[PDB]
């Protein structure tokens, strides 16, 4: 912009968007074939492309902040947007939590809905909340505390060794949750097909796990950034989203934990 008076970021053209929309189309259409007896190849191609897109796109995001496009308002603009994203995320989970709560309260039975059945479902074996569940909840709370500690250092003391230290700790504890999570599946007392409790129990923690992984990945990115010195106490947006997001995951797990392990036994 030849002669502007404003700090908002205006962007050169960009192919990324179109690319990613084809990747997804192919992704999903391959994903429909693959759940219909046919071959994976189409599905992975779709995702491979999308993943190429996303990386670029985000690489460029950083690159653009490095060219000093991320002025004061810009910085705030992204902050905001990301916050609607977690708002959205929160709504999605409201679907899964809504089924759980309805079935848990008004389970189906032969006289439904004059009369309700029984929950947990007959012959269902809910897990022990204090054995592994608590383990995974200590594991995230802890990681939470280790990722925020990174944040504050950087912003408050400008200590960068400490910053990367908080991050590794936090990142490897995120993966641990995954590992423990999977254990839980391995040892599950009920199945996934044919029984509401399996679908709810599985899809719900299924979605949460998705996110942890996303979370743990994200963080990974920051560590890397932090290793090549990409963050200052004033400018540190990836970091801000990261910590905000990790926190949302943790919140969601904590409510799950209270809703499905602790309250539904």
């Amino acid at each position: 912009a030849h002669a502007k008076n404003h700090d908002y970021h205006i962007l050169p053209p960009s192919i990324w968007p179109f690319m990613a929309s084809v990747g997804a189309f192919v992704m999903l259409f391959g994903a429909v074939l693959w759940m219909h007896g046919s071959g994976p190849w189409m599905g992975l191609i779709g995702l491979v492309v999308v993943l190429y897109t996303m990386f670029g796109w985000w690489s460029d995001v950083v690159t653009e902040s490095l060219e000093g496009d991320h002025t004061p308002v810009v910085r705030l603009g992204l902050r905001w947007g990301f916050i609607l994203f977690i708002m959205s995320e929160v709504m999605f989970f409201s679907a899964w939590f809504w089924s759980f709560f309805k079935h848990a309260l008004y389970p189906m039975g032969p006289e439904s809905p004059i009369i309700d059945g029984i929950f947990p479902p007959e012959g269902i074996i809910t897990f022990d909340p204090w054995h592994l569940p608590l383990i995974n909840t200590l594991i995230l709370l802890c990681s939470g505390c280790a990722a925020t500690w990174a944040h504050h250092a950087l912003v408050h003391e400008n200590n960068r060794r400490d910053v990367a230290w908080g991050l590794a700790l936090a990142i490897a504890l995120g993966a641990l949750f995954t590992v423990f999570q999977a254990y839980e599946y391995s040892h599950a007392a009920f199945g996934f097909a044919g029984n509401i409790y399996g679908a709810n129990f599985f899809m719900a923690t299924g979605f949460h796990g998705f996110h942890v992984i996303v979370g743990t990945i994200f963080l990974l990115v920051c560590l890397i950034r932090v290793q090549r010195g990409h963050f200052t106490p004033e400018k540190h947006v990836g970091f801000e989203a990261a910590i905000w997001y990790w926190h949302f995951v943790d919140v969601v797990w904590l409510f799950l934990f209270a809703s499905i392990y602790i309250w539904g036994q």
Partner: protein, 547 residues
């Protein structure tokens, strides 16, 4: 300026706005077309067009014969065709057509100008919005050619996909439509975020929220609904996909499922949808009433608050769409009472409009006619909704043509009007070519004439009990049908008219050279700019006094 550079790698919010428009036009036509097909078959009793026999002929082959009557005797009633059509319509129309012109075409382009911002907060993202919308559409269309229920192609299920019908239906057709819906969701949620950051963050100095144009507040409320309502619908349909692809049992009584919860999860998002469709419409009307009655929009705060009013109530009235699917009396009351409340907020909007016109001089220009039709018909529509809001009366009305009319009056004779309203009023601004004041009028008069014919009869049918989504009906119902169908053709005519009128104008229209071709009262910032606006609108920030 590579052609591929411009539209294929767009970062500008005025072009993305155009892309959505035509895109949405396109599909509407296609969709609209499916509408004549139906009307055709429903013109008269028995099944003359959707016979079984045409299936033997390749698609190329029977297609063409399908546009030509057969005798009852030799006609083999293929209900599945009809179902797949009905749903081609619905799915296209509430997800590919009307929300992408009105929210992403007129909003994307103008909401920004009215506040006096350079461009949308997230340009790359926005472009991604527009492309996801295409995939959406494409999967959605492809679905009409893939392995459908009953050995045919195509999912004949319902715009909303209810189970167990939706979970038992063979093929992978419905899987495509499920994912279409997701990519559409995606689209609006990216869109939604972008306008929400944009509008709070990028407005011009001195522009207070209470200093913003109606139309951008409309997109603002619209956007919020979206944000909070699509998510819930991603979920619903994930449950339909895992039931049919992963043998789950969300809504499968054999596994302790409950088809009704689905209806709860889907109407909680299926109510917010309409308030998205009309929201923007309310916005474009104010403008147009303001400009053409050459007088400030009456009760501007109340208008804004009305809009918030609606949007909030819009999340707490979804069981009105389930009055007979097995609900507690306490649940019918709560939902009947609270759904009645929305009246307050809308009437206010309706009265203000009449009070804007009151005591101003009026310009019956094309744009205005629509705006006035809209005030009428949306009221028509409206009332019905109160009749439908009463569980009691709903029994008899639910699922019958009486509800078909109420939605088309507020959708086809409502939001749709808005769309056109928008179109006529802003065609030069975004083209540098004005349209013909005659044609327009003609179009407006045809459409009002025939669209009234199309749906008004349907009120009768509804009270004479004709059921919804039937491909044939009793002898008793021929009379009105005829009328209706006739009606539909007329309107279909008109839409053709309009496209040409459009074509012509973008070909041979009046070059536009003024920055405001209308009059002093159109006061927002879009009118200060050229005609067709600069590539980078607002490099220089609009000085406070400027407007």
């Amino acid at each position: 300026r590579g052609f591929f550079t411009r539209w294929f790698m767009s970062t500008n919010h005025k072009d993305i706005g155009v892309l959505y428009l035509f895109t949405g036009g396109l599909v509407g036509l296609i969709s609209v077309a499916f509408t004549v097909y139906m009307r055709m078959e429903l013109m008269a009793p028995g099944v003359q067009f959707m016979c079984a026999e045409h299936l033997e002929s390749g698609l190329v082959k029977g297609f063409f014969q399908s546009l030509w009557p057969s005798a009852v005797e030799n006609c083999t009633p293929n209900g599945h065709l009809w179902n797949v059509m009905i749903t081609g319509h619905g799915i296209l129309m509430m997800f590919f057509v009307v929300i992408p012109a009105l929210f992403g075409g007129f909003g994307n382009y103008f909401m920004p100008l009215h506040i006096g911002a350079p461009d949308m907060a997230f340009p790359r993202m926005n472009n991604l919005s527009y492309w996801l919308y295409v995939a959406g559409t494409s999967l959605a269309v492809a679905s009409l050619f893939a392995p459908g229920g009953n050995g045919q192609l195509g999912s004949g299920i319902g715009w909303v996909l209810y189970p167990p019908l939706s979970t038992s239906e063979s093929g992978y057709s419905t899987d495509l439509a499920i994912f279409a819906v997701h990519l559409s969701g995606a689209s609006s949620i990216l869109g939604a975020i972008n306008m929400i950051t944009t509008f709070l963050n990028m407005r011009a100095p001195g522009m207070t929220m209470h200093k913003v144009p109606l139309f951008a507040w409309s997109i603002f409320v619209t956007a919020w609904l979206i944000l909070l309502a699509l998510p819930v619908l991603a979920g619903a349909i994930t449950m339909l996909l895992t039931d049919r692809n992963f043998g789950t049992t969300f809504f499968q009584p054999s596994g302790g499922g409950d088809p009704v919860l689905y209806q709860h999860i889907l109407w909680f998002f299926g109510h917010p949808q309409v308030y998205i469709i009309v929201l923007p419409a309310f916005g474009i009307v104010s403008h147009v009433i303001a400009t053409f009655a050459k007088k400030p929009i009456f009760g501007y705060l109340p208008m804004v608050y009305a809009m918030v009013a609606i949007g909030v109530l819009g999340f707490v009235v979804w069981a009105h769409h389930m009055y007979t699917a097995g609900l507690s009396l306490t649940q019918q009351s709560y939902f009947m009472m609270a759904t009645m409340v929305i009246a307050v907020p809308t009437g206010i909007k309706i009265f203000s409009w009449i009070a804007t016109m009151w005591g101003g001089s009026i310009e019956l220009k094309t744009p205005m006619l629509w705006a006035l039709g809209f005030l009428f018909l949306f009221t028509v529509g409206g009332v019905t909704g109160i009749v439908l809001s009463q569980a009691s009366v709903d029994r008899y009305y639910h699922d019958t043509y009486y509800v078909v009319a109420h939605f088309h009056y507020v959708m086809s004779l409502g939001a749709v009007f808005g769309i056109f309203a928008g179109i006529y009023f802003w065609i030069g601004k975004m083209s540098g070519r004005q349209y013909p004041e005659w044609a327009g009028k003609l179009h407006f008069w045809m459409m009002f004439v025939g669209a009234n014919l199309t749906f008004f009869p349907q009120h009768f049918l509804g009270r004479q009990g004709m059921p919804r989504r039937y491909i044939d009906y009793p002898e008793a119902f021929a009379t009105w049908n005829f009328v209706s169908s006739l009606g539909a053709f007329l309107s279909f005519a008109s839409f053709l008219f309009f496209l040409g009128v459009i074509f012509y104008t973008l070909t041979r229209g009046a070059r536009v050279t003024a920055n405001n071709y209308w009059n002093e009262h159109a006061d927002t910032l879009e009118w200060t700019l050229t005609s067709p606006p600069p590539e980078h609108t607002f490099e220089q920030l609009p000085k406070r006094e400027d407007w």
